[PDB]
Coordinates of C-alpha atoms and ligand atoms in Angstrom, one line a residue:
X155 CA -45.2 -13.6 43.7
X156 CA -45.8 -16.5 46.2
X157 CA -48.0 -16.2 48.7
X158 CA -47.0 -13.8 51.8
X159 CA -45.4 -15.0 54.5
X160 CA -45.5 -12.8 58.1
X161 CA -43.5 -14.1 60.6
X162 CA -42.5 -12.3 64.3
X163 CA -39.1 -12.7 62.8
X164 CA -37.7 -12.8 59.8
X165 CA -34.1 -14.4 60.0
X166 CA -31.6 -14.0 57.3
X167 CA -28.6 -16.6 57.4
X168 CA -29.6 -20.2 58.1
X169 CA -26.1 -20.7 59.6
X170 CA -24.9 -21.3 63.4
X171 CA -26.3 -18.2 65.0
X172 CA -29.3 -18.2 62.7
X173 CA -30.0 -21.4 63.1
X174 CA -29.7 -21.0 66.9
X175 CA -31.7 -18.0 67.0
X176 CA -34.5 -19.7 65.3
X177 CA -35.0 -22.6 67.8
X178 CA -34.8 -20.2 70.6
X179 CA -37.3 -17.7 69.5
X180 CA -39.8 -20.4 68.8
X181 CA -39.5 -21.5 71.9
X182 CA -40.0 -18.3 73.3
X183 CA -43.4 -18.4 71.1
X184 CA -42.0 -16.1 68.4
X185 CA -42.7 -17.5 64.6
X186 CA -40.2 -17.1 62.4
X187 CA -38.5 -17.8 58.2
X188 CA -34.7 -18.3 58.2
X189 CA -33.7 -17.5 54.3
X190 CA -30.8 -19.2 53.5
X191 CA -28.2 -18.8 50.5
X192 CA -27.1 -22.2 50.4
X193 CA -28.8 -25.7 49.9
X194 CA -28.3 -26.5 53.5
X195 CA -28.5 -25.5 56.9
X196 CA -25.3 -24.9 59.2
X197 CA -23.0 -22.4 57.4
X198 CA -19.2 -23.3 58.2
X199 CA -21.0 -26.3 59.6
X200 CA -20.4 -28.8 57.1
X201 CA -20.1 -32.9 57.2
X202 CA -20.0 -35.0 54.4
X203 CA -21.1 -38.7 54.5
X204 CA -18.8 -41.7 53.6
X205 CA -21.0 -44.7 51.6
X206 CA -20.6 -46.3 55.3
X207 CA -22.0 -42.8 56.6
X208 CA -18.7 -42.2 58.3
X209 CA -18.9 -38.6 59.0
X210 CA -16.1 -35.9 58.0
X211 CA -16.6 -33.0 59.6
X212 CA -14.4 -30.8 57.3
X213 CA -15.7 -27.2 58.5
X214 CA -16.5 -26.7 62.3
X215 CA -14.9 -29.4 64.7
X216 CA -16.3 -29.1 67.5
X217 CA -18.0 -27.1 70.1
X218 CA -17.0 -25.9 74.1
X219 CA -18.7 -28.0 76.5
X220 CA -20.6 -25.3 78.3
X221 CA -23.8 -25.5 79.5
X222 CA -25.2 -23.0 76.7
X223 CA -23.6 -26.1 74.4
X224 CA -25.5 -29.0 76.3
X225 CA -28.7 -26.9 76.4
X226 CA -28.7 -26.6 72.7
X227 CA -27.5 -30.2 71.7
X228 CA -30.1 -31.6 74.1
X229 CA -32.6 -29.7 73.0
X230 CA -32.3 -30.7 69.8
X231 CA -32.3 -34.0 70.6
X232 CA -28.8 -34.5 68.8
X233 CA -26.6 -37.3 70.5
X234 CA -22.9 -35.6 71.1
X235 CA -19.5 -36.6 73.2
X236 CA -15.9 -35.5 73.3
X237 CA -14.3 -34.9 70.3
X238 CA -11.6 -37.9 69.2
X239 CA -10.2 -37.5 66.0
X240 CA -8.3 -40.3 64.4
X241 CA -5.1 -41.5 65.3
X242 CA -2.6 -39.8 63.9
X243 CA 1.5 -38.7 64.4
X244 CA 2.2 -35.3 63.7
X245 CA 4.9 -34.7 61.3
X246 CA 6.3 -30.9 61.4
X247 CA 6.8 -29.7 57.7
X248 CA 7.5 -26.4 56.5
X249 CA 4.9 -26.1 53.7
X250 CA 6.5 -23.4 52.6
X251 CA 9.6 -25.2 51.1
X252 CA 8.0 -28.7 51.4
X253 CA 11.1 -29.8 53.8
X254 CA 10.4 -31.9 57.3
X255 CA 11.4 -29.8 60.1
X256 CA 11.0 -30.3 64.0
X257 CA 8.8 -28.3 66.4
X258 CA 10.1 -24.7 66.7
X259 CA 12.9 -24.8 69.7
X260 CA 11.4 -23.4 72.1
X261 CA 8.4 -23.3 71.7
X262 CA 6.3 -24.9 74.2
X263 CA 2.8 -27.1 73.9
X264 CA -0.7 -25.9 74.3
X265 CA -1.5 -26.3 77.7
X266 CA 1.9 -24.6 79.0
X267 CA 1.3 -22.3 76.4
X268 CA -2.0 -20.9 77.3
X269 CA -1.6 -20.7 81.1
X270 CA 1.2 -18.0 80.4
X271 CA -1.0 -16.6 78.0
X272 CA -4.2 -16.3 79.9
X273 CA -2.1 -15.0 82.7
X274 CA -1.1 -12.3 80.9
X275 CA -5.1 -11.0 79.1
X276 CA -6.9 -12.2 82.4
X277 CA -6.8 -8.1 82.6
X278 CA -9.4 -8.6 79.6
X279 CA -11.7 -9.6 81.5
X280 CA -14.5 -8.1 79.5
X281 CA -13.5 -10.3 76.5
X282 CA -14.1 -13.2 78.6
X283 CA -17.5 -14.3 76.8
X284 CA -16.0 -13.3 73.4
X285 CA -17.8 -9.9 73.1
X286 CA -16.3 -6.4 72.0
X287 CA -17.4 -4.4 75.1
X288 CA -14.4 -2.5 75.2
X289 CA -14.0 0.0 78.0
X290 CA -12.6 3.7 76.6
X291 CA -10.2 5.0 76.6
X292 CA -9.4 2.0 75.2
X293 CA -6.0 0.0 76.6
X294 CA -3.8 0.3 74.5
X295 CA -1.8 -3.1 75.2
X296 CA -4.9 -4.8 73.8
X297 CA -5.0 -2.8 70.1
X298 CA -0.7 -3.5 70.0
X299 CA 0.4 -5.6 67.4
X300 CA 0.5 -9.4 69.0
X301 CA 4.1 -9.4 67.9
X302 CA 4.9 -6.5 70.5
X303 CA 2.5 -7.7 72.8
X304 CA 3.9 -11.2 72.9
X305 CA 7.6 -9.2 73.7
X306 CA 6.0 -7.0 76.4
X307 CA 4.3 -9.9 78.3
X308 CA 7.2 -12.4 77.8
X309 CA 5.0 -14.8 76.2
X310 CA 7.6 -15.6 73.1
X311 CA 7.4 -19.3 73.8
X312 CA 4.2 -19.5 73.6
X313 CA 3.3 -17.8 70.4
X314 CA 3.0 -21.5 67.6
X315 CA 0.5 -22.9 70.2
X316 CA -1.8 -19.5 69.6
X317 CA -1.2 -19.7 66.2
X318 CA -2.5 -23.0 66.1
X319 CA -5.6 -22.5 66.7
X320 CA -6.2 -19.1 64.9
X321 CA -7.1 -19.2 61.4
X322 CA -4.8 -16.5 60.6
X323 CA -0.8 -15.0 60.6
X324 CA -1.2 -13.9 64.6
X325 CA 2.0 -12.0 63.6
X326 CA 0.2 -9.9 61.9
X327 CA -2.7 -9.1 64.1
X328 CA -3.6 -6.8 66.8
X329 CA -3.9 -8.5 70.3
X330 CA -7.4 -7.9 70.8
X331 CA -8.3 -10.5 67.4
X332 CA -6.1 -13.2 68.7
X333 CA -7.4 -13.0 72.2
X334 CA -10.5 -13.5 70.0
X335 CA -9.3 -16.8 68.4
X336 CA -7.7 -18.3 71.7
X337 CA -8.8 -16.4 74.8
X338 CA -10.0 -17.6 78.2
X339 CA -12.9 -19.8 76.9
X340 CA -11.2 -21.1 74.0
X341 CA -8.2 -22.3 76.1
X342 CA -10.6 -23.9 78.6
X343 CA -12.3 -25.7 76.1
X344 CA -9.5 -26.8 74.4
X345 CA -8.0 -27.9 77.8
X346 CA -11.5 -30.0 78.4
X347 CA -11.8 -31.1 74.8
X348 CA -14.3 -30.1 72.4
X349 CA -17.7 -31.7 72.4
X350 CA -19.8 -32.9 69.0
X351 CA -22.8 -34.6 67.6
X352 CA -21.8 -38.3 67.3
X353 CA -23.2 -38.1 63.4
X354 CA -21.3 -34.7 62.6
X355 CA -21.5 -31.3 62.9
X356 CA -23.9 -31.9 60.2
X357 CA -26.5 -33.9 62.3
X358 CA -27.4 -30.5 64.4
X359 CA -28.6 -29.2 61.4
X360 CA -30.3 -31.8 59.6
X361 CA -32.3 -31.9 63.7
X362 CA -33.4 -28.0 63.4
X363 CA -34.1 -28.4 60.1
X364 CA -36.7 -31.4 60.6
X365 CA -38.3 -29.2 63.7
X366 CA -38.0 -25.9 61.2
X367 CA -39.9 -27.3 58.0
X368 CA -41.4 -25.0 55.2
X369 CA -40.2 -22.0 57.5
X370 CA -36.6 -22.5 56.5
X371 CA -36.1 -21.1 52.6
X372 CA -33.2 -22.9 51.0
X373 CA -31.1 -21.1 47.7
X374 CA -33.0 -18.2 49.1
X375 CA -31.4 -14.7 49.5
X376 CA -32.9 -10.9 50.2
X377 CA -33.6 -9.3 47.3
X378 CA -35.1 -6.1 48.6
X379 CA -35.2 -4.7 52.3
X380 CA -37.7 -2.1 53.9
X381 CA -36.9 -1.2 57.5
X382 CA -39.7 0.4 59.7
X383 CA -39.9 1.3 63.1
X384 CA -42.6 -1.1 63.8
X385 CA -41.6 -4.0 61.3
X386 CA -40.0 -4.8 58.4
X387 CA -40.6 -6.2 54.6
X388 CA -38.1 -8.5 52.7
X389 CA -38.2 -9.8 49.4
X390 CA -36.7 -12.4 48.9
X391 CA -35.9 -14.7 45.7
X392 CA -35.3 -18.0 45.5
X393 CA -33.2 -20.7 42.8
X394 CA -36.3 -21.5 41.0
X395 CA -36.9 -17.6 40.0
X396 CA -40.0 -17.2 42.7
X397 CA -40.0 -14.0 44.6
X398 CA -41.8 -14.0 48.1
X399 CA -42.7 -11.1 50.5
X400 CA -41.8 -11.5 54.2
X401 CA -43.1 -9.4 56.4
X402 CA -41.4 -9.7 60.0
X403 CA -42.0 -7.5 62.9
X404 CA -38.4 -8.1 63.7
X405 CA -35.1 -8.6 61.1
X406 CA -32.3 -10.7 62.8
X407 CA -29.3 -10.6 60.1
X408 CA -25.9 -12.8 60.7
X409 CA -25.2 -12.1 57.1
X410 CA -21.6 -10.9 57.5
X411 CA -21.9 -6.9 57.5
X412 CA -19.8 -6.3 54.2
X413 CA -21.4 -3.5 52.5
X414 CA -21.3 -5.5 49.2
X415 CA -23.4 -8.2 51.6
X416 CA -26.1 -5.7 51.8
X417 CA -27.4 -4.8 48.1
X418 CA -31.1 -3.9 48.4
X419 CA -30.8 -3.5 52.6
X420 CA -31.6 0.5 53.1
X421 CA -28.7 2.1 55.8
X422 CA -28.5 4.5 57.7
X423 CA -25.3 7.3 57.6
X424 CA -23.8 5.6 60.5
X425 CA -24.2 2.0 59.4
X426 CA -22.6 3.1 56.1
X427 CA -19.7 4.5 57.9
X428 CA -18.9 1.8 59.7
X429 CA -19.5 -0.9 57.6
X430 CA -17.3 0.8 55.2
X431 CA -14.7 0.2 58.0
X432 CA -14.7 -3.4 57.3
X433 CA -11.1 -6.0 56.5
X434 CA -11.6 -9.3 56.1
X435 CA -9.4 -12.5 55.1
X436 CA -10.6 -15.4 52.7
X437 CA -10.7 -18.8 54.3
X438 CA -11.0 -22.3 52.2
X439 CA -12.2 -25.1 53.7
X440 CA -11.6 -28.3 51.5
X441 CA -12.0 -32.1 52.1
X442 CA -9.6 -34.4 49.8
X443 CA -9.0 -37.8 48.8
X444 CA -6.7 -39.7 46.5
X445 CA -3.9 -37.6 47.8
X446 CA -0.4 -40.3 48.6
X447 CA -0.3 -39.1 52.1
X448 CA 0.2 -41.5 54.5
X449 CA -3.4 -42.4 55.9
X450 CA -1.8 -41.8 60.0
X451 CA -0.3 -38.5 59.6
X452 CA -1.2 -34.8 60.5
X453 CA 1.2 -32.5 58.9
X454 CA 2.1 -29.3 61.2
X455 CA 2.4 -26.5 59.1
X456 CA 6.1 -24.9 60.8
X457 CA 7.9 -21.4 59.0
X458 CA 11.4 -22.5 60.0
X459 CA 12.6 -19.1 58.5
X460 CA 10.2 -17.0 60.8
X461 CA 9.6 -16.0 64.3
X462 CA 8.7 -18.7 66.4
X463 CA 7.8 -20.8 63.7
X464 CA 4.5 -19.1 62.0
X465 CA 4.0 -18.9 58.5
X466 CA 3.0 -16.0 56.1
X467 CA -0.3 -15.7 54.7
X468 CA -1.6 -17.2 52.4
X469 CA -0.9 -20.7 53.8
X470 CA -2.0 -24.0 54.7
X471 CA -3.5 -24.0 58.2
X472 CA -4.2 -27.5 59.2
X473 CA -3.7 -30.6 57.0
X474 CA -4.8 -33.3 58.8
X475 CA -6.8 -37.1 58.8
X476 CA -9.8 -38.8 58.6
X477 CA -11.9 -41.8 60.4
X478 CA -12.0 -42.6 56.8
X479 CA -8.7 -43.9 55.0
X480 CA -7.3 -41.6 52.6
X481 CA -9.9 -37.9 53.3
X482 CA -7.5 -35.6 54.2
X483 CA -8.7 -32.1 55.5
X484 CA -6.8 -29.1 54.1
X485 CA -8.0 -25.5 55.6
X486 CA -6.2 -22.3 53.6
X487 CA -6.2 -18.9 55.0
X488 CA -5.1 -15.8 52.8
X489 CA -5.9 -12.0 52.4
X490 CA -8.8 -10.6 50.8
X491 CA -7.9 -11.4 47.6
X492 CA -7.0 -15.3 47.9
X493 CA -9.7 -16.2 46.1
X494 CA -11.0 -19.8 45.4
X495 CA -8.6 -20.3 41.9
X496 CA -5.8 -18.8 44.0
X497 CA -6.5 -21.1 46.9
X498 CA -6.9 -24.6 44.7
X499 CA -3.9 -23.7 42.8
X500 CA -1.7 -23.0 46.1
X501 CA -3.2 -26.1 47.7
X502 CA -1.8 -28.0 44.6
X503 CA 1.1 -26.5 44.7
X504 CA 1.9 -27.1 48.0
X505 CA 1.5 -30.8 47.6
X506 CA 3.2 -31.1 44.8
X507 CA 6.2 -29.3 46.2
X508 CA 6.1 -32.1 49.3
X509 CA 6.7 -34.6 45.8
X510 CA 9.3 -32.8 44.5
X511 CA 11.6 -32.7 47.7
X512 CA 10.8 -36.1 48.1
X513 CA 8.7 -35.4 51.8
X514 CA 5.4 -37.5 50.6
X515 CA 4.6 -39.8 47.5
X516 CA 1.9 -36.9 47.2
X517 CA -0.1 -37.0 43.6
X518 CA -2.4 -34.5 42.7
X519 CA -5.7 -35.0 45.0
X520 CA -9.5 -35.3 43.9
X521 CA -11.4 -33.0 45.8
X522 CA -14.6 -33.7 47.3
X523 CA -15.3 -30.1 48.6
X524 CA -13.8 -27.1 48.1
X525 CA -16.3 -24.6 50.5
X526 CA -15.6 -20.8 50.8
X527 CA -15.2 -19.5 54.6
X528 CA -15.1 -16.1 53.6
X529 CA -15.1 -13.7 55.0
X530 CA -12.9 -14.7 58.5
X531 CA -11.7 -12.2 60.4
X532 CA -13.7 -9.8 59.8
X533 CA -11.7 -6.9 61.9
X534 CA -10.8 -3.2 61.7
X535 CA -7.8 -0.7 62.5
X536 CA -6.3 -0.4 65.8
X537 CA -7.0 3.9 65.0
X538 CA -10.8 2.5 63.8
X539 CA -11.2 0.7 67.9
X540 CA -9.5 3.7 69.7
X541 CA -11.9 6.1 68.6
X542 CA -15.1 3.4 69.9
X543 CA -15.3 1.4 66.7
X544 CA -17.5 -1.4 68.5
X545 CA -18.6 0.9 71.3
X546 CA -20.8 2.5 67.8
X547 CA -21.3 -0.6 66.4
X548 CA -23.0 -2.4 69.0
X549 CA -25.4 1.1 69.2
X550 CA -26.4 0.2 65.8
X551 CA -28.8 -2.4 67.7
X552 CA -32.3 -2.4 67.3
X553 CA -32.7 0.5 64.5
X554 CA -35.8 0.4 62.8
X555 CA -36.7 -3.2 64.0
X556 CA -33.2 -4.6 62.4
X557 CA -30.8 -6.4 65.1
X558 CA -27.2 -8.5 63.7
X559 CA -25.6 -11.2 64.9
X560 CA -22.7 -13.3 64.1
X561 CA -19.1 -13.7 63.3
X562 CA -18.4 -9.9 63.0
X563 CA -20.3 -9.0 66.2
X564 CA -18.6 -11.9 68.6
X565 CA -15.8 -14.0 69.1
X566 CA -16.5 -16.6 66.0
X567 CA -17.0 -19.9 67.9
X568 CA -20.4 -21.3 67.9
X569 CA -21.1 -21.7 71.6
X570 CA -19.9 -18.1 72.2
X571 CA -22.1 -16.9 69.7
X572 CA -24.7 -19.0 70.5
X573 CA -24.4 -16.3 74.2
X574 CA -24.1 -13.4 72.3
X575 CA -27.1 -14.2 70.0
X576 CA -29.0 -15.1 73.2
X577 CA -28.3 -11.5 74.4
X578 CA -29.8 -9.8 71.1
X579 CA -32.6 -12.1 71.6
X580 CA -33.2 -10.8 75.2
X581 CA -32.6 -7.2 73.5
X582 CA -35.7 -7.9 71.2
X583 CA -37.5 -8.8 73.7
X584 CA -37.8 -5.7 75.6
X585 CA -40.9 -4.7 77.0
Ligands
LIG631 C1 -14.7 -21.5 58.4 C2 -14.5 -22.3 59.6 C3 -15.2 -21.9 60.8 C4 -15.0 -22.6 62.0 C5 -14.2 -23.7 62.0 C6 -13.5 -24.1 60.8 C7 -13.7 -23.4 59.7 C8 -12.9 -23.9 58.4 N1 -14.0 -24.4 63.2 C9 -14.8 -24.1 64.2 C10 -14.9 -25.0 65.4 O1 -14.3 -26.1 65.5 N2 -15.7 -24.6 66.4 C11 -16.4 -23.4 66.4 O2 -17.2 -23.2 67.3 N3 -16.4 -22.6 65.3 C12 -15.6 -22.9 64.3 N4 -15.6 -22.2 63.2 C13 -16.2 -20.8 63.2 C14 -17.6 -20.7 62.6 O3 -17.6 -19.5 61.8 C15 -18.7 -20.5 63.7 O4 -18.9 -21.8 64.4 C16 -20.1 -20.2 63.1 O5 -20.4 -21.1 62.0 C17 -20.3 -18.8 62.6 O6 -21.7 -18.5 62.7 P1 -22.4 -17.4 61.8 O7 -23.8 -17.6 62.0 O8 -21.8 -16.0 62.1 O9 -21.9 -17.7 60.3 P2 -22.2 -19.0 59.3 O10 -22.3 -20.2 60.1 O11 -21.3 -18.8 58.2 O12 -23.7 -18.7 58.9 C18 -24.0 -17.6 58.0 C19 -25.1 -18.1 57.1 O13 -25.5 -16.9 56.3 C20 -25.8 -17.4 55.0 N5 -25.7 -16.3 54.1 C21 -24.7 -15.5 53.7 N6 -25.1 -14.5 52.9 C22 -26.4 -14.7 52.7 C23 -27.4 -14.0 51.9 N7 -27.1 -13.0 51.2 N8 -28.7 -14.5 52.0 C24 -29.0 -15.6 52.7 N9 -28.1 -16.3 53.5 C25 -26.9 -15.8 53.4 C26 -24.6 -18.4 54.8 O14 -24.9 -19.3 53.7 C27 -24.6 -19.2 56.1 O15 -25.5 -20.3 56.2
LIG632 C1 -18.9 -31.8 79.8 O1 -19.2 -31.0 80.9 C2 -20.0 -31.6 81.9 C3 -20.2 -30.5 83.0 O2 -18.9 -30.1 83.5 C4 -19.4 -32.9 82.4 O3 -20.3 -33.5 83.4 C5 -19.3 -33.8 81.2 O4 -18.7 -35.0 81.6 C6 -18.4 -33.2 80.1 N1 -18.4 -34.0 78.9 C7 -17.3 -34.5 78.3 C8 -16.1 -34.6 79.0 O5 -17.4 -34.8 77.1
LIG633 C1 -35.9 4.1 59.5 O1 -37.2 4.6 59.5 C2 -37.3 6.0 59.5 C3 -38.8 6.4 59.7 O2 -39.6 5.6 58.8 C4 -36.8 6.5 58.1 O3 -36.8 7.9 58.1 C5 -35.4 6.0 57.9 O4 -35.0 6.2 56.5 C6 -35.2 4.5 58.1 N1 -33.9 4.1 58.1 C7 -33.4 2.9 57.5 C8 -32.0 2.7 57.4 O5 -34.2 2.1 57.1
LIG634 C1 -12.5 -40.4 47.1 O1 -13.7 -39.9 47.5 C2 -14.8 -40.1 46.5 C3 -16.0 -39.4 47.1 O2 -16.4 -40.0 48.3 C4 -15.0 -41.5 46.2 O3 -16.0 -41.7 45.3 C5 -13.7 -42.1 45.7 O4 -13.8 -43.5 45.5 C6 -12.5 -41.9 46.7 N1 -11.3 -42.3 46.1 C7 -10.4 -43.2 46.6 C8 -9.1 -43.4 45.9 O5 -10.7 -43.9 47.6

């Protein structure tokens, strides 16, 4: 083995909140190793760099301009502004049958959108910084389907605009994961406009990782966990074949919570159960070139053959342009099971279907990165939150020196999990 490192905290996930969390506990004066799966920092973060170092940003977008958002841009030194994509018109096609359509009648635009629809879950008020802290009895208008919800509330017109900006068929949610994707922050920020790092989403990253040095292991994953009450030991292994022990007083993990995620990681009964609990979606994120789209366009993915417009899964999500001429991003969202051969071929398909009723001059694309999202939506049964399925989750906290954090625990935009991380930290903190 390599030599031993002991750290205060051992992080595992060198994505957004485990990135986060490391620059803020070493400010606090807590040491720290962030093991990370992949060769870079930044997770669903993800920019790749032109020749001219044009950045495409073809993951995260952007960021809400809160100060929890300025605090950590600044303090990392990253230069950032208002998001302003390209110039682009939209064109509405139904990607389903390849065939231009119009925007759903009807259906209104974002910001008329979201003003009914934050009228009507301003009663959610504990959802307002994008964690589960759901009172219980639990309401039951927040675990109805969205569909009913959106009849109930009278909020039919403003149903595409939602879907929009979830990464997900809305129709077939629960209310409470929407208001998760587009709640009362989410709308504001979108109002405002997202802020970013001038050089990419990827910039933030390259920033921590510079600060971070040898205490960030890259193609490094936990091999084997022990969990004590005063401290923990991870081994971990690395690309090269070279195991290392870690010893932490603290674990942080914003590994998603799958129970296949957690070979080698000892659980108790009750994490068990609950992770067992667990559905999740695949998301693909790719960035193409080479594709005979027109270089000005964003195409709107509209179902004209389904309520108010939103497709089925598995679908295209966005399809839309690049600084760049000719990168096109192309984000895919399907069930567990839409895998990344599924999702390539279904991309393909779909373009090739926009040939074929003569929509684009599309020819099959090159692809410059295909990157796995998944899981997203990590969620559970309406039944599973009625009988306190986060309440118990949340209590899971702090056993035998192990705290989470992440997607699965908070509302999966950086900037609010950047908060909830913040409030773990404070948690591991006690005195
Ligand atoms: C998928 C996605 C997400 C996204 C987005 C667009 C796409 C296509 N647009 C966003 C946006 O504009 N604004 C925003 O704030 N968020 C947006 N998102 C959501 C995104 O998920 C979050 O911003 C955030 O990245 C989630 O943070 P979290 O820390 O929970 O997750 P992560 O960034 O994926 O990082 C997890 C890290 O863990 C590593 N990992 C996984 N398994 C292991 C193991 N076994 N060992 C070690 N490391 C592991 C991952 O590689 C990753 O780095
Ligand atoms: C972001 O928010 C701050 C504080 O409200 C504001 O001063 C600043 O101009 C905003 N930046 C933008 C619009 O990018
Ligand atoms: C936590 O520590 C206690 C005491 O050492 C031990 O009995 C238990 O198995 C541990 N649980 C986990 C999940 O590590
Ligand atoms: C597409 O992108 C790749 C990778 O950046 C580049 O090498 C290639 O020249 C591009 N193709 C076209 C047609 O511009």
């Amino acid at each position: 083995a390599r030599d031993t490192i002991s750290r205060d905290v051992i992080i595992l996930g060198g994505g957004s909140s485990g990135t986060y969390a490391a620059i803020r506990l070493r400010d606090q004066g807590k040491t720290v190793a962030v093991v990370e799966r992949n060769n870079y920092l930044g997770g669903h973060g993800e920019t790749y760099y032109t020749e001219d170092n044009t950045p495409l940003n073809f993951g995260v977008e952007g960021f809400f301009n809160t100060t929890v958002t300025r605090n950590y841009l600044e303090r990392l030194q990253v230069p950032y502004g208002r998001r302003d994509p390209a110039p682009a018109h939209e064109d509405y096609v139904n990607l389903n049958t390849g065939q231009r359509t119009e925007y759903t009648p009807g259906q209104l635009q974002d910001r008329e959108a979201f003003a009914k629809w934050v009228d009507a879950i301003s009663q959610f008020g504990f959802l307002d910084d994008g964690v589960y802290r759901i009172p219980e009895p639990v309401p039951e208008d927040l675990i109805s389907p969205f569909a009913d919800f959106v009849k109930k509330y009278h909020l039919e017109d403003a149903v595409y605009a939602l879907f929009s900006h979830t990464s997900g068929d809305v129709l077939e949610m629960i209310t409470l994961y929407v208001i998760q994707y587009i709640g009362v922050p989410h709308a504001a920020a979108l109002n405002e406009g997202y802020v970013r790092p001038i050089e990419g989403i990827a910039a933030l990253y390259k920033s921590a990782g510079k600060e971070l040095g040898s205490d960030v292991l890259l193609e490094t994953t936990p091999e084997a966990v022990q969990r004590f009450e005063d401290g923990v030991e991870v081994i971990v292994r690395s690309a090269d074949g070279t195991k290392t022990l870690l010893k932490g007083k603290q674990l942080l993990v914003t590994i998603p919570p799958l129970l296949e995620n957690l070979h080698g990681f000892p659980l108790s009964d009750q994490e068990s159960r609950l992770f067992s609990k667990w559905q999740y979606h695949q998301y693909w994120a790719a960035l193409v070139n080479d594709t005979g789209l027109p270089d000005d366009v964003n195409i709107v993915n509209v179902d004209t053959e389904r309520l108010y417009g939103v497709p089925e899964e598995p679908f295209i999500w966005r399809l839309d342009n690049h600084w760049a001429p000719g990168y096109h991003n192309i984000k895919l969202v399907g069930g567990s099971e839409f895998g990344e051969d599924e999702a390539k071929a279904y991309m393909y398909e779909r373009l090739d279907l926009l040939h074929a009723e003569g929509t684009y001059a599309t020819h099959k694309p090159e692809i410059v990165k295909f990157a796995s999202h998944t899981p997203v939506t990590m969620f559970v049964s309406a039944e599973e939150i009625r009988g306190g399925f986060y309440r118990q989750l949340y209590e899971l906290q702090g056993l035998n020196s192990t705290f989470w954090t992440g997607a699965t625990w908070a509302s999966d935009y950086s900037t609010l999990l950047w908060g909830y991380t913040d409030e773990v930290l404070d948690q591991m903190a006690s005195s």
